[PDB]
Amino acid sequence: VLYVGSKTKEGVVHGVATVAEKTKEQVTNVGGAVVTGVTAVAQKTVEGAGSIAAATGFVKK
Amino acid sequence: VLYVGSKTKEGVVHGVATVAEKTKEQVTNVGGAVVTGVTAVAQKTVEGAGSIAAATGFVKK
Amino acid sequence: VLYVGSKTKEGVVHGVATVAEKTKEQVTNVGGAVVTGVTAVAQKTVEGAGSIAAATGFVKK
Amino acid sequence: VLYVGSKTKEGVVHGVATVAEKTKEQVTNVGGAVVTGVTAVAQKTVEGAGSIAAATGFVKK
Amino acid sequence: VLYVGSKTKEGVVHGVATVAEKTKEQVTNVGGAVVTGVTAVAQKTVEGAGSIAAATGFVKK
Amino acid sequence: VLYVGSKTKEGVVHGVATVAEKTKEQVTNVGGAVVTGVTAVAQKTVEGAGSIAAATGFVKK
Numbered sequence: 001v002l003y004v005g006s007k008t009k010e011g012v013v014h015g016v017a018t019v020a021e022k023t024k025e026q027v028t029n030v031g032g033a034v035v036t037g038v039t040a041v042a043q044k045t046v047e048g049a050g051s052i053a054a055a056t057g058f059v060k061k
Numbered sequence: 062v063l064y065v066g067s068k069t070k071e072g073v074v075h076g077v078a079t080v081a082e083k084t085k086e087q088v089t090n091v092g093g094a095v096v097t098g099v100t101a102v103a104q105k106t107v108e109g110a111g112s113i114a115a116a117t118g119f120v121k122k
Numbered sequence: 123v124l125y126v127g128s129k130t131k132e133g134v135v136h137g138v139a140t141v142a143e144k145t146k147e148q149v150t151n152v153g154g155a156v157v158t159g160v161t162a163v164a165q166k167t168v169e170g171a172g173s174i175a176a177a178t179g180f181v182k183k
Numbered sequence: 184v185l186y187v188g189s190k191t192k193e194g195v196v197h198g199v200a201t202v203a204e205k206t207k208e209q210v211t212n213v214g215g216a217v218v219t220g221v222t223a224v225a226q227k228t229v230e231g232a233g234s235i236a237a238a239t240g241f242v243k244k
Numbered sequence: 245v246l247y248v249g250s251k252t253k254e255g256v257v258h259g260v261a262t263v264a265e266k267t268k269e270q271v272t273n274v275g276g277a278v279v280t281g282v283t284a285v286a287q288k289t290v291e292g293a294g295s296i297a298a299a300t301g302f303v304k305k
Numbered sequence: 306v307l308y309v310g311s312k313t314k315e316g317v318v319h320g321v322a323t324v325a326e327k328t329k330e331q332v333t334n335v336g337g338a339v340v341t342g343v344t345a346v347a348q349k350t351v352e353g354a355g356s357i358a359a360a361t362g363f364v365k366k
Contacts, residue, residue, distance in 0.1 A: 005067075014198060036220065283343065304365050
């Protein structure tokens with residue numbers, strides 16, 4: 001059971017942002033969802049044994 | 062059970078954004094969904110053994 | 123069971139956006155849906171063992 | 184059970200940001216969700232023995 | 245059971261920030277979620293023996 | 306049971322920051338979650354036996 005409510009006159013919002021000028025290699029990496037607004041709500045659930053999650057930037061062999 | 066409600070006079074919203082001028086390689090990578098508005102809601106569920114998720118930037122052999 | 127409601131006088135919204143000036147390689151990559159509006163809602167469900175998801179930027183052998 | 188409520192006249196929010204000029208290599212890596220707004224709420228649950236999470240910057244073999 | 249409430253006239257919030265000019269290598273790494281707003285709430289739970297978490301900067305051999 | 310309330314005319318908050326001009330290697334690493342606002346709340350729970358947590362800077366072989 002979840003209840004949320006809100007009131008506002010003004011507002012401005014920014015999520016993820018990136019700038020690069022002269023870089024050779026640059027990485028932005030995310031595993032979940034990305035959710036955005038004046039009001040934002042997010043939920044998840046997983047069931048069963050042996051679950052794995054593996055957020056990784058890069059690999060060189 | 063989920064309940065959401067909202068009231069507002071003004072607002073401005075931005076999701077994911079990216080700029081690159083002279084970079085050699087650049088990557089933006091996301092594993093879930095992307096949801097955006099003045100009000101935004103998102104939900105997910107997974108069932109059964111041995112679930113896997115593997116969000117990766119890049120690989121070189 | 124889900125309930126959502128809204129009232130607003132003015133508003134402006136932007137989804138995913140990209141700019142590249144003189145770059146050699148650039149990649150924007152997404153695994154779910156992209157949903158956008160003044161009000162936005164999204165739902166998903168998966169059933170059965172051995173589910174797999176594999177959002178990857180690029181690969182060089 | 185969770186209850187939340189808010190009242191505000193003005194506000195400005197920034198989620199995650201990044202600037203890089205002449206660096207050779209640079210990485211931003213995150214394992215969970217990113218959630219943002221004037222009001223933000225986030226929840227997760229996992230059930231089972233073999234549970235693993237492995238957030239890593241990079242590897243060189 | 246949790247109850248939270250707020251009233252405020254003005255406010256400014258910055259979550260995570262990072263700036264790099266001429267560095268060879270630079271890493272920011274996080275194991276959980278990132279949550280940010282004028283009011284912010286986060287919760288989590290894990291069930292079952294032998295649970296592992298291993299947030300690491302980098303490895304070389 | 307937990308209860309929280311607040312009242313404020315003005316406030317400014319910075320979560321985590323990092324600056325590096327000419328360094329060879331710099332690492333910022335965190336094993337938990339990062340949570341930030343004018344009012345902020347965080348909670349965790351683990352049940353079982355034989356748990357491990359291993360937050361580390363870097364390793365060289």
